[PDB]
Amino acid sequence: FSCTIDLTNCTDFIEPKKLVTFFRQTIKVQGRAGNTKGIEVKVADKKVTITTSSAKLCKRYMKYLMKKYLKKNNLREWLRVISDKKDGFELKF
Amino acid sequence: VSLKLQKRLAASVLKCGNRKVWLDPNETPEISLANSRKAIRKLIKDRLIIKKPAAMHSRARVVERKQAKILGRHTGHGKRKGTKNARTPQKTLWIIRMRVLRRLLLKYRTTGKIDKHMYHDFYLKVKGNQYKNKKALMESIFKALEEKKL
Amino acid sequence: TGHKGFSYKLKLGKKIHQNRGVPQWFRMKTGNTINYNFKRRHWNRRKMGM
Amino acid sequence: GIRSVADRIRVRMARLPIEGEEGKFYTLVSYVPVASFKGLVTKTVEEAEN
Amino acid sequence: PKQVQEFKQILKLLKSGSIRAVRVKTNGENTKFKVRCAKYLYTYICADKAKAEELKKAIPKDIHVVEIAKKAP
RNA sequence: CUGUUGCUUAUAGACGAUGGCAUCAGAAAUCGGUGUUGUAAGCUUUAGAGUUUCUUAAUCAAUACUCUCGGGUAUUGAAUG
């Protein structure tokens, strides 16, 4: 299972390296926080992908957490998460 | 200017009530010129007329109650307002009781554990309310089978 | 009503045709005292009873 | 609701000239949320900024 | 509306002169040759694309053939 | 000189009346004093009867002590500055 985050035009607002740390520390698979031993986020530069098949995860979970982070730094107003209908998510204004 | 005509039409076009229609307040001069459905159908695509979402009706409160009632959290004596027969009908506790028993009697007879003459004296015994549950019938069949071989 | 017979619909049609006021040009004749229609009625004032 | 009103409200008013003629003024009672009302006095706010 | 079940009648039906117009819909997996006769509308659901080509050459030139896709005409 | 008007006026009052002040006016908050209720919200006392688990820890857990004589309210017809 794979899911990607498109940061091609919002990268000025969000540094992609920052999201990498946020996902590994907040994603829960069996119930704890930061237990993303089987899940890798890597870098992928302009995009961010999870592409982990060792855990029971869902596409909508990423949208839940992506919307969760967008409220962490009061960035929800200027952005909006929109799926690209091709196994991934993209951000617009 | 009254926009009653421009709001009723957008209720039929969007297939929603007059309360769910949202006409832009900043575009009153533009909306007020749409006196026909073909004009209203162009405002909706221009997002000057949108459809309000329904009010949220969360069932999270009820689900946690039904989950607690499973463990018997609330099924007390002061939380019952109805008669014992009303909550648990006496007829349907016995309709199911025999269907549980008479199915076992036929299952053993078909299998070959018991014969027609023994299954006949057990059909009426079940019918007379002698065995309270399924467990208390297989024990009696087990008992009456040993007396057979003597 | 929803279901009206033919001889009954044409009589209603005449009772809406007769429920009209004086034409403007008629009142401007000479010695014309017919300024208003006094045989008029309305649906909420007088039921025509028919 | 209609049956209740906040016990204490910390409002802010501003006398401003009207859009049409500057000789006629009008007030605009704003709202200033406050965590607590301890030590809050009737303060005259003056921005004086560019 | 009726449905034909195999190649025997659909090929026979097209050669007959009662046919009014023919429509073909190309779905994701299969294709239906909804020929329109005098009375009903007969359709054959073909899954093998090769067997559709021989069906696409059997229509007489004297009738209107409309090829539909993921967008209605 | 009196009356109106103002303090959405009190020691008065159905309306008038009556009583006080009218720039040393008056009002509004705030801080004290004085009262009413009963210990606020956040986390801690393996307090906590047990269940669940990792498999020999955490999770959930009415209630419950510490901060707490705490929070909230207090003229509206209460009294100071």
Added chain:
RNA sequence: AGGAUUGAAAGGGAAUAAGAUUAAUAGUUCUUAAUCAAGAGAAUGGUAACAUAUCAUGAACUUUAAAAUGGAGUGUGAAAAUCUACGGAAGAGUUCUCUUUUCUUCUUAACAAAAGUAAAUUCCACUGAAAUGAAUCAAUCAGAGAAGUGGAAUUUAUUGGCUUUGUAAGAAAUUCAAUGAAUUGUGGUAUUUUUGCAGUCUUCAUAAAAAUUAAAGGGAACUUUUGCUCGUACUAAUAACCGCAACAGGUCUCCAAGAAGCAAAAUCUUUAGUUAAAUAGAAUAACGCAGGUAAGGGAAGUCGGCAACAUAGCUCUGUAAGUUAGCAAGAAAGAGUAGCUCUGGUGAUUAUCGAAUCAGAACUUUAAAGGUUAGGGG
């Protein structure tokens, strides 16, 4: 040939649906897809029940059947709604305190087809039941023939009941981009409604007629055309009807979400409708209408417990005189009821899965039906 006319927009009746459109009409218009009527161009199979994309001749006369029929209560098949399990796709809400979280959409007609597959009832063929059996919640049935095995027919909101298929995704719903793009699995031994089936019960009640249609007994001799007349707007009511009116009166029906309970009760909310419906502001006197409370006593008030107060749900124990032996009886009287954490009992398939229901034990508190609904007794 056997008896004339009228008599029902709730009785009988040949045949139509989905999507879209209008400032209003749409089972009436447009697109697509159907159906009916009237025309026009002397047969086989199965032991039997019975069966063959019109087929397979069938006049006079006669008969049978359908149209065609009360109610009560129980059980059950199916669909829809609600609830819910697994897996998701798209969007929306909350987020400094947390929540793999809460919500919305994920649909399909008339008419036809037969991959797969049900419940009930009535019949047929083989054999002939006793040591009597078969079966239902209840019944009920059998040597004028039970049970068993194999078959046949009919009902189950159009063909053939459910899934499935043509219609049909090209429609529609939910999203994205500025006309073009994405998705539309599978379950449930849950509650209600609707519609059928099966037997049971009740009548000194037995609960319509014809048009019209089919069969039997008898043996006399695929295409195309047309479908005329009349109603169709609107309210159907705390403003379109009747009451002298925008009168708190009266007026026959269909559709029906969540919480909670025994309950279509009272109370709150979702889709939908409305914020106006014989004018408002100020002051907060008397006397009022409507709703309340009270020290000590408790009917001494009064024609009279008028009015008001009080008992109230459920579980367990107990329940007198009298009596038409059925009743009195919820007689009277007494005990329990909360919250949290647990345990056990009630089933299907060969450990998994599903239902609200009953019982019991610890610990805590403000010691528990009482917000609403809700017997005063002798």
